Amino acid sequence: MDNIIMTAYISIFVQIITAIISVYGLFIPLNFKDIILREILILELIVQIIEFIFYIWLIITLQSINEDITYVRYFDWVLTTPVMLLTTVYFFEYMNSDDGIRKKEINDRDYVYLFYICLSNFFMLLIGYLGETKQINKMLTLFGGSFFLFLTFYLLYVKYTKENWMNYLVFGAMFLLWALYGFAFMFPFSIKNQMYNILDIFSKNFVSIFFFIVILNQSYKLL
Numbered sequence: 411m412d413n414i415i416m417t418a419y420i421s422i423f424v425q426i427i428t429a430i431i432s433v434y435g436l437f438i439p440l441n442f443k444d445i446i447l448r449e450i451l452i453l454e455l456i457v458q459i460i461e462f463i464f465y466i467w468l469i470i471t472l473q474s475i476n477e478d479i480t481y482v483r484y485f486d487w488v489l490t491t492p493v494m495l496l497t498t499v500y501f502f503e504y505m506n507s508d509d510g511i512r513k514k515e516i517n518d519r520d521y522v523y524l525f526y527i528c529l530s531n532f533f534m535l536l537i538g539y540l541g542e543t544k545q546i547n548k549m550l551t552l553f554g555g556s557f558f559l560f561l562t563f564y565l566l567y568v569k570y571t572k573e574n575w576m577n578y579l580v581f582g583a584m585f586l587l588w589a590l591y592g593f594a595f596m597f598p599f600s601i602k603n604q605m606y607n608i609l610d611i612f613s614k615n616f617v618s619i620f621f622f623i624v625i626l627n628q629s630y631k632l633l
């Protein structure tokens with residue numbers, strides 16, 4: 411319980427730093443080819459805002475924790491994870507494109523496929539939620555949740571990697587990170603919530619820093 415609070419504080423600290431860096435990133439000048447990076451960073455900021463709200467709620471709630479509140483993370487995940495899957499698509503397309511493609515042209519063209527990526531993800535979270543609130547056994551949760559995790563990442567792979575080895579490396583790192591959310595689900599209250607507190611730093615905040623550094627690097631090249 412003390413370690414859940416401690417890791418929450420560490421997570422909130424990293425979130426504050428990353429939020430400030432991200433706001434700064436919005437003002438960095440980019441060539442026409444690179445503007446989609448700012449479009450991505452704005453969506454990451456929106457993810458950060460929802461994450462920050464949950465973590466403020468968490469640190470207040472923990473002060474008087476009289477129940478397993480793990481399930482409340484899903485109110486965050488249900489909103490943030492679909493946005494994070496879209497930013498991944500946008501980045502893959504940015505890497506695959508010669509002319510400065512923007513998210514609007516990707517959305518207009520692929521909205522149906524994007525919907526199916528997010529629908530697969532939703533079913534993963536729904537099954538996970540049923541498991542976390544103990545409406546179904548852990549083994550059925552892992553099985554169902556794992557299937558939709560695999561379905562989501564397969565859909566992302568076959569459409570958007572386009573034999574780009576940079577896309578492959580980002581894909582493998584992201585898949586492993588998301589999979590560890592599945593492994594965390596197997597642990598008791600305290601360990602599981604410490605894991606989620608720190609995994610969120612990697613999946614959300616460190617990913618924001620990556621986009622910030624790429625923006626900085628592309629801005630320097632420009633000038």
Ligand SMILES: *C/C=C(C)/C=C/C=C(C)/C=C/C1=C(C)CCCC1(C)C
Binds near residue numbers: 538
């Ligand atoms: C910022 C929050 C993120 C990226 C959350 C991702 C959550 C998951 C990848 C959850 C995965 C699960 C399984 C693979 C099976 C067990 C149930 C879940 C939902 C924990």
